[PDB]
């Protein structure tokens, strides 16, 4: 099992860490959503589909920076929605092919009261997501860490 982003940075077998820079909408109105789609960014595959099945869960998802201070929302993951930042681990997504498949995660963040001005600064850390991988075959349980950065500014009308 290995994962890589859209720009080609990989995490080898066994876990690791990587950085993701995401284009966001420039404005989000009061009462609207800021969609951070990560299915188009993070891709994962299974090396031995003939004999092993891999189970992949989002073990934790945390807020940082502007998203921590100005936003609240929910995470969307394989059939259902959960709070963000996450209060527990999610159910499992099964990976059973040697070809890349997206990691189907998305954040729907909406401005809180008393948000205004530059809500998110460019290049700032807005989330860390942990992908936990377990397999049918043996006792392996590895963690793939993902650091999410804003690639532009975001403003909120007051």
């Amino acid at each position: 099992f290995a994962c890589k982003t859209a720009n080609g940075t990989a995490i080898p077998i066994g876990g690791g860490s990587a950085n993701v820079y995401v284009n966001l909408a420039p404005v989000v109105n009061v009462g609207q959503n800021l969609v951070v789609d990560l299915s188009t960014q993070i891709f994962c595959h299974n090396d031995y589909p003939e004999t092993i099945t891999d189970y992949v869960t989002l073990q934790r998802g945390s807020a940082y920076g502007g998203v921590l201070s100005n936003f609240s929302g929910t995470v969307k993951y394989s059939g259902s929605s959960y709070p963000f930042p996450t209060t527990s681990e999610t159910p499992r997504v099964v990976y059973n092919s040697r070809t890349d498949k997206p990691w189907p995660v998305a954040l729907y963040l909406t401005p809180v009261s008393s948000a205004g001005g530059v809500a998110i600064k460019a290049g700032s850390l807005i989330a860390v997501l942990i992908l936990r991988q377990t397999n049918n075959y043996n006792s392996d349980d590895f963690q793939f860490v993902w650091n999410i950065y804003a690639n532009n500014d975001v403003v909120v009308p007051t």
Partner: peptide, 9 residues
């Protein structure tokens, strides 16, 4: 509710 935020089964 916000229609696109939640799945439908």
């Amino acid at each position: 509710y916000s229609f696109t935020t939640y799945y439908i089964h």
